[PDB]
Amino acid sequence: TEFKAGSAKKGATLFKTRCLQCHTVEKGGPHKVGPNLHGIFGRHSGQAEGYSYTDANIKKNVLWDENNMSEYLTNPKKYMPGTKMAFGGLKKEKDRNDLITYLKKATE
Ligand code: HEM
């Protein structure tokens, strides 16, 4: 790995202030701007039923792993050009560690 866990309580917060905006995490939460995150990891890109994902996302066939996801939150549009992720990224290794510790806990 190239991912080191961090603060789950730190993640929780980043995510509110940075992605709640368009997404929900709990099982049985709805899609909003972006898709619902429950059971993301180990899950392949663009596969939640009832959501219309860019053709970009869909063909990236990304395999969602803490590792995968970090590169991804860095700058998604570079990662998958054409995605309608309206997110410039988490420039910082730490915030990102924080968040995916979060995301790895809350989406499970
Ligand atoms: C905040 C740091 C943040 C997270 C975390 C996040 C996660 C994320 C993932 C992992 C996907 C891929 C989906 C898949 O099911 O395979 C994804 C997709 C989209 N997002 Fe998101 N996202 C974060 C930030 C933001 C913000 C702040 C918005 C809205 C302003 C947003 C929106 C979207 C959209 C739209 C998509 C789908 C893209 C496509 O089909 O190309 N995200 N999100």
UniProtKB/Swiss-Prot annotation:
Cell compartments where the protein resides: Mitochondrion intermembrane space
Disulfide-linked positions: none
PROSITE patterns per UniProt: CYTC
Co-factor binding comment: Binds 1 heme c group covalently per subunit.
Family under the similarity heading: Belongs to the cytochrome c family.
Classification of source organism: Eukaryota, Fungi, Dikarya, Ascomycota, Saccharomycotina
Organism name: Saccharomyces cerevisiae (strain ATCC 204508 / S288c)
Name of the molecule in the record: Cytochrome c isoform 1
Induction and repression of expression: By oxygen at the level of transcription. Expression drops rapidly when the oxygen concentration falls below 0.5 uM O(2).
A single BP term in Gene Ontology: mitochondrial electron transport, cytochrome c to oxygen
InterPro entries in UniProt: Cyt_c-like_dom (IPR009056), Cyt_c-like_dom_sf (IPR036909), Cyt_c_1A/1B (IPR002327)
Function: Electron carrier protein. The oxidized form of the cytochrome c heme group can accept an electron from the heme group of the cytochrome c1 subunit of ubiquinol-cytochrome c oxidoreductase. Cytochrome c then transfers this electron to the dinuclear copper A center (CU(A)) of the COX2 subunit of cytochrome oxidase, the final protein carrier in the mitochondrial electron-transport chain. Isoform 1 (CYC1) is the predominant cytochrome c during aerobic/normoxic growth.
